[PDB]
Design a protein around this nucleic acid. Structure first.
Lengths: 87, 332, 333, 87
DNA sequence: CTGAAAGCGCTAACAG
DNA sequence: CTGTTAGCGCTTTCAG
């Protein structure tokens, strides 16, 4: 599955929310990935994600290729807005 | 006289070897035997001993953190990053303040190693050879955060303070500022001298502007030193039309020192801090400042360590998280 | 398996027990002996293993520090006090955040005792009867820091948050104020509903001034909530003449909120903060705050623990450090 | 021994400075003491001191009786101003 | 799958 | 003084 969100966070994707997200994307067996400006990184990984520097006012896509790639995006969409991180 | 892994063993007709295998979730166990001991645990109320385990396993699921002063708004954040990523990986933390004292830092490094930590995250304004010398002597990995190591040997995780300062100076000249000043920190520290100063001095000739020694104020990240900076700046005739501060806590000191002298901001001057700490947001006008992903620098650092500690190889050991600038109301 | 107290004892033709006494600085050792063994140590580069020491001695010389959020301008300072006094008495600290989550709190408490810590300093905003329960069946001493425990049976160090507010409030009354607003923090935490709030009401009551709910705003320790606070106050038909804040950040936010709406402090409104963190001095105008010796709270807390750990007897397990108001330019004269 | 100072420190006798003083008086065998308009406390005791609540503008008296009592009171006068506490 | 074999590194306790 | 005795609570390690 997949979906495109627009970072609304005043500070982009960083701090606690980034962790909260990465930690969620790592609960499922699905291989979640973050596609931004072309480069992609494992969402279950901190170094990679935070290395991107997702500042505010941008767009991304959340992958999902496993036996729950749907239960993933739903929960991922959850925090994605629960932590005020776009929609 | 707690209950040991022995009590449990008997309470299930199984060797301590199995009780150990179950508690550590080891594959080679029969679901009958397992669910047999597991409840055998809760019945006795067994709680493992991390020390005992630590002696026999050569591992303590604990990391050591050496920070200069946890009361700083800056380090306290960085620390928050570390602590969080650490528990995301079932690791624990041992904190101690160094206050930038070489003897204390090294004594800590020793004390930490003594307690048998699985890894170490180090922070300090002046990493000397005598330091690197002692680093290479540790059985466990050591990661650096928001620090500057000339020798380039230990794996760090910061940003390019050199360029970061350039970016700032540039965006200023591009606004029409001839005479610009810099409020640095103790030059006794590399990070200030061999990085923040240079990125500033190169942005000058690269803009064809002459270097003015009287436009470089040395503080100590102290709000107070901040005020004493702007003051000493408006003293002399050639007074800058914009100032750059090494830290935000100092920037506020410059803003206020100005308003207390009459001049308005940004009405009369332009100031930019460096850190993007919640501080730069609790002032009027809301200070503009170079953004440094403090939390991230901590989280990444601790994360990078979890790899090195797990032996898993990693592409490059020196990371440079991306920085940027956020303009607010302390500029035109 | 490299260079152990065994390898040393051999390099010094003496027994481990001697290498021990020597390493742990015991009297019973011929200065000639102590010399030799000390030589060997530096000859092999021997560094004693603290964990093995812990297994045998039954004490790890490390305490557990449970704090809600170390990034706080408040706890950070509170911790620094604890860390210093610990290092003063040769003790290491295990730090960990609870974010006020009762589950994570009580969890950590276990994890820690698991690591075999000698003691624990606990800083939480909601100490339940279960918490107290858990604190009673702990093999090691537990000391509270800048926290409130209704049952008040577990040892702790702090100030009298009830009296602090009262003073600040009575002070404003003694300057001709009649409609004082109290910007508090989450009422879920007893310190705000059972301590600061009551002190605020007991002040007006003794001044015979009616209690007006509108004059009571609930923030969340956050600067932003400090702005929404000033608004909802200078938004009421009957507006306050002075506002007291339960935290410096919030108060520091009350200021600015009003400074945006053209209101000038302290000319058009009296402001008072609580805690006295460096923050107060970094505001303009300076902020008048209730002084709470945070660093001291932490230091005396860790000190109390060392006592309770070395099993020394102590008069009064509950300590109240003195407080005082400090007026700056956030109020009139 | 004996001596009376006037707390000039902005923050009074508290925080880290109050620690240094207490750690300083501790390295001396002689029984050191600090008196504040009223009661007296053992300078070598963190609690004893910090509970006094000494604010800027108070007269405290330091008394050290013992062998190094001289070297002690001497090393305390140092701290008092090298830390910016009292004159 | 399990239990038996062997400590990990170090304090401890008291006789001679 | 100093050496001896004897584990602390748990992994480890392979036969069986």
């Amino acid at each position: 599955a997949q979906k495109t969100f627009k970072v609304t966070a005043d500070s982009g994707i960083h701090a606690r929310p980034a962790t909260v997200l990465v930690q969620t994307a790592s609960k499922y067996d699905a291989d979640v990935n973050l596609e931004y400006n072309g480069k992609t990184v494992n969402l279950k990984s901190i170094m990679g994600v935070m290395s991107l520097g997702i500042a505010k006012g941008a767009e991304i896509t959340i992958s999902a290729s496993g036996a729950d790639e749907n239960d993933a995006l739903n929960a991922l969409e959850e925090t994605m807005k629960s932590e005020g991180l776009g929609e | 006289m707690n209950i040991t892994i022995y009590d449990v063993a008997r309470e299930a007709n199984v060797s301590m070897a199995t009780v150990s295998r179950v508690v550590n979730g080891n594959p080679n166990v029969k679901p009958t035997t397992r669910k047999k001991v597991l409840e055998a645990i809760e019945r006795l109320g067994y709680r493992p001993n991390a020390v005992a385990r630590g002696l026999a396993s050569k591992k303590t699921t604990t990391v050591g953190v050496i920070i200069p002063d946890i009361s700083s708004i800056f380090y306290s954040e960085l620390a928050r990053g570390i602590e969080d990523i650490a528990t995301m990986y079932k690791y624990n933390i041992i904190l101690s303040n160094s206050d930038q004292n070489m003897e204390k830092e090294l004594h800590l490094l020793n004390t930490m190693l003594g307690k048998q930590v699985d890894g170490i995250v180090f922070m300090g304004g002046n990493i000397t050879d005598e330091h690197v010398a002692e680093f290479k002597r540790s059985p466990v990995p050591i990661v650096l955060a928001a620090s500057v190591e000339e020798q380039e040997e230990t794996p760090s995780v910061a940003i390019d303070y050199e360029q970061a300062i350039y970016d700032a100076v540039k965006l200023l000249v591009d606004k029409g500022h001839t005479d610009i000043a810099f409020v640095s920190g103790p030059m006794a520290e590399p990070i200030n001298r061999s990085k923040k100063l240079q990125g500033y001095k190169r942005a000058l000739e690269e803009a064809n502007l002459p270097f003015n020694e009287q436009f470089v104020a040395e503080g100590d990240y102290t709000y107070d030193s901040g005020l004493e900076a702007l003051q000493h700046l408006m003293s002399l005739d050639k007074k800058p039309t914009a100032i750059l501060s090494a830290t935000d806590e100092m920037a506020l000191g410059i803003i206020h020192a100005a308003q207390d002298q009459g001049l308005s901001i940004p009405e009369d001057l332009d100031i930019i801090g460096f850190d993007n700490t919640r501080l730069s947001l609790m002032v009027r006008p809301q200070l503009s400042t170079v953004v440094q992903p403090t939390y991230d620098i901590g989280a990444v650092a601790m994360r990078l360590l979890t790899k090195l500690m797990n032996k898993e190889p990693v592409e490059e050991h020196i990371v440079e998280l991306p920085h940027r600038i956020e303009l607010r109301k302390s500029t035109k």
